[PDB]
Amino acid sequence: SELLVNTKSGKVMGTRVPVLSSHISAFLGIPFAEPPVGNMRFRRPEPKKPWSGVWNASTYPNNCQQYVDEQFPGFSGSEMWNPNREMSEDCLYLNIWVPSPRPKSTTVMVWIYGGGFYSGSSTLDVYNGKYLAYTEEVVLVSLSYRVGAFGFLALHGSQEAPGNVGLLDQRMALQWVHDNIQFFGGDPKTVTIFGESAGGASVGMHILSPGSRDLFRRAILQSGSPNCPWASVSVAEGRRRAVELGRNLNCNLNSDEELIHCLREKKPQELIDVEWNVLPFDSIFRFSFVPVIDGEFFPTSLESMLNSGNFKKTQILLGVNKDEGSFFLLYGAPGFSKDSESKISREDFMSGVKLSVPHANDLGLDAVTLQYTDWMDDNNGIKNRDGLDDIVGDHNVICPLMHFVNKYTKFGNGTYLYFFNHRASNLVWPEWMGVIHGYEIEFVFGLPLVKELNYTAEEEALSRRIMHYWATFAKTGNPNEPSKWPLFTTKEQKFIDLNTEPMKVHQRLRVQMCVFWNQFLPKLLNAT
Amino acid sequence: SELLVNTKSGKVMGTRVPVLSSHISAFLGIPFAEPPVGNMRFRRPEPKKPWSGVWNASTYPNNCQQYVDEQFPGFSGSEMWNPNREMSEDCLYLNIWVPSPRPKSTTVMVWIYGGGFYSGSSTLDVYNGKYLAYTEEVVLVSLSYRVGAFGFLALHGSQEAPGNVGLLDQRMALQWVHDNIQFFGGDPKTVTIFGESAGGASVGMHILSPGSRDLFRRAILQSGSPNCPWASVSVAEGRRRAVELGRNLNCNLNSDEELIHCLREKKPQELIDVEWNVLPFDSIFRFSFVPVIDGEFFPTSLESMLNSGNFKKTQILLGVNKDEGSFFLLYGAPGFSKDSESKISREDFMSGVKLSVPHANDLGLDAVTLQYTDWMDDNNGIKNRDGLDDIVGDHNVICPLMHFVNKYTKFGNGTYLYFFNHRASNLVWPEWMGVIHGYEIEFVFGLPLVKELNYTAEEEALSRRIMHYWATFAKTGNPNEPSKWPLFTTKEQKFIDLNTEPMKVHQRLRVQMCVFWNQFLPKLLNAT
Ligand SMILES: *[C@@H]1O[C@H](CO)[C@@H](O)[C@H](O)[C@H]1NC(C)=O
Ligand SMILES: *[C@@H]1O[C@H](CO)[C@@H](O)[C@H](O)[C@H]1NC(C)=O
Ligand SMILES: *[C@@H]1O[C@H](CO)[C@@H](O)[C@H](O)[C@H]1NC(C)=O
Ligand SMILES: *[C@@H]1O[C@H](CO)[C@@H](O)[C@H](O)[C@H]1NC(C)=O
């Protein structure tokens, strides 16, 4: 039977699913770790004990426990990102879409979801792997990992809540794929991990971390990179936030044992309810529990690892969207609203930059403001809104990714860079948000090929070339079929725009602004 | 006799001079102070003792002792600025051009020459007052004042070399004009002082200084303002440079008396020969002996005076040229040459900015470099040259003038701002220097009306409107004849370009760069 696969952990029974008037097989909710519940909450994941009998893999698993977005009740724009399954701490499962008939040894792609390390689900309709699997003949895998305090509460030195366990969940799933994907027809020697935002930062983290390198062949990072300012914290900041979380739950704070014990008795929603109270600053685009530079998963600082070539050398494909910051301003900066054009006054612009660069002294704040203000037209509301949008996107996504790419390329074996700037014709979000953070995902997963979703024919064509660029890169380490996407090089720094117009090649993606964020501002904050 | 004028200091006999196929009267070399020689060197000027008999005023006076430019021996571009008379410490004279027949009580314009406070002459062909006097029917006066150490050696507290004596020379000439111009047909109640570069900074200094305010009605400042970074020094820096000058001449340095006595015995050229050795930094656009913030001529800091409205309230007309910095780079920055296009490498650009902002720490230097570098094309030689040209002009002339104008306008009675950007068709300087510092003077003095000088007909027309704008402003406090040059206002900040094309009105002259130089950079250097 095509739907029965025998793995090293036990037999699994899949289900047949329709896709673009055909069918492929799906193995949903395969467990890859023991349930991290009870006294195992905050601990490193344990591998799933083999089971006898047949694991029913016909339906999606629970999603991990997480904050749920209620900003726009019922609005599809925001709810398409919320958990669409019941939540549970028992959430460590993976899903596999396999072409029919079963491949013998084909290219594998493993998706790692984003969500700021505090949210995310592998079961979202925009992450349905059937279109990509089917269209490109690849075995598509989506894993899951603990988020929020459950995945990243860090009390360095403690073995009970060491931190990074969410990253270790991802690693365990990659280990399982390495060990078992052959039985699904996948080639374990040709696995590409790919992910967006925190998922893209996670991808870069596995490229860096010695303990993860051997489990995959190449990588794709969308709108995220490991060195992003919101993607990690020191063990000291992690410790301080863990303690502050305990202080919010009236925990005994005398010892780590006392703290962890108290946190383990709290129901999931008690932790989620106060999670946001531990941030050190009034900020935007910052999340409470994220990866920690612990000296283990990350042997040293991320910058010294990037500088020294201490990372996996292979090919990478990565890029960003045009208006990465609009989401974060809508949700937390004064003057931005879902239903207005959100023209920003000069005072809101300034309160916007303070929120955007929480770690900056006043000189630094002045440097940012001057860098993004058109002084011939400082009261232009559209300009202030857009300027703020760029500050958020440049600081949080684009410039960190550009710093990663330039450092990586010195030691890597091949880099392909894109700038995604097509705004979907059917976007329900307002016009002022532009080509929003996360809205290239639907094209990567091929939603434009399903007529009912209402995209345009040219949008379907774009989705098809992105899928084929992604799958061909996974297969060969080059997105081009043997009009060309050129390699990004240290010298030339070439990249392509990704949209419905004839490909166009450019160079030095946002250099001007990124020399500011990657070279001048940090030098400025360190001297003052 | 039209050429004989009886003044309070004695009778003076002028000479008749031809001008544009007509004639006017000229009284050249009228003394207004006792010769500041011997033990009077470095001292405040003393008024000229009246003489009996007739002072022969038919020929130009000596020019003050000064450094002489020998960079391009025989080149007219540079020698047109050098003394064209024998030099002498006995140089305190003024020249007057009077319409014929003699006016009864007409508008007076008094020119104050520039030259970085270390050079300058009232007798230069480009300063010939006959064209303006004749064409606009004004009594035109050019004064002289001590420059270099002779005019600005400052040992605060000493009454022998108090500093600012060169400014006091200018004041004495303004006093003489106040007291005697009526006899030449000039109206002492309608005198406009006007000057370029250091002469324009001097004009602003008389507007500020309580002791000078009452001696004139209005003012015109060309490419210079009182708050320029090269126009003044603290009494401490003045003292240190005075002492260092003495140290260069092997002077006894035990007391001010010892120092001054030694400096007074040195021949003029001995002081001029080591003058440049006292600068505190390796720099460009910085001069050794300049005005000192002494608590007397300037009661307090220039900024607090500007901020508090502690200055003469009247109308002012002022502006800058497009490429103010080219001269200074040609003369002292690596990579610039008179006979090449001077395309600048990235390394020379950087050594250029260090020379341009001598007082800056490394963070400050980085801020300047980032502000003026196009990171999409950082090796563009033309761009590097031009970028450097703007850094020098913006920092030294334009932004300080824009700061002065915005502060002045809050309390003044009328401001008219221009941006002069026509490059003379007959310029002998290379093309890369653009609309060079000082080359609007020839249009203000009407050289384009003399056919042999080879300007174009449209250039003659431009000179005529500038002369009439300047003279009408002097007469009325408004350059317009009752297409309009609008008033500059705090709100609108309007200005006009001055060239051969139809007038065009703009706003916020170099705002972007000037917020950098007037607000951000100083805040940055003060915190670091
Ligand atoms: C597999 O599980 C689903 C979910 O409840 C169920 O509906 C389906 O009938 C099951 N099939 C088998 C063979 O157990
Ligand atoms: C990648 O590595 C291979 C094998 O070592 C080498 O031949 C090739 O030049 C490299 N490609 C790039 C783009 O560095
Ligand atoms: C005035 O002085 C000039 C300069 O030497 C001389 O040539 C001229 O003849 C003099 N005229 C009188 C009347 O002294
Ligand atoms: C200048 O002052 C006069 C007289 O006090 C006043 O009427 C006029 O409004 C002022 N003009 C400007 C431009 O301030």
Side-chain angles (χ1 to χ4, degrees), chain A residues 13 56-59:
Chain A
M13 181 67 179
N56 187 330
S58 62
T59 69

Side-chain angles (χ1 to χ4, degrees), chain A residues 315 412-414 487:
Chain A
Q315 306 80 35
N413 187 232
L487 212 47

Side-chain angles (χ1 to χ4, degrees), chain A residues 362-363 366-367 370-371 373-376 378 507 511-512 515-516 520 523-524 527-528, chain B residues 362-363 366-367 370-371 373-376 378 507 511-512 515-516 520 523-524 527-528:
Chain A
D362 293 6
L363 185 69
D366 285 335
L370 170 63
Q371 190 75 188
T373 298
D374 176 348
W375 295 100
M376 275 277 16
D378 64 303
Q507 302 181 262
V511 238
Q512 201 64 35
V515 168
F516 171 84
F520 184 76
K523 183 165 179 179
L524 168 38
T528 42
Chain B
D362 293 6
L363 185 69
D366 285 335
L370 170 63
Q371 190 75 188
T373 298
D374 176 348
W375 295 100
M376 275 277 16
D378 64 303
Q507 302 181 262
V511 238
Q512 201 64 35
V515 168
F516 171 84
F520 184 76
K523 183 165 179 179
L524 168 38
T528 42

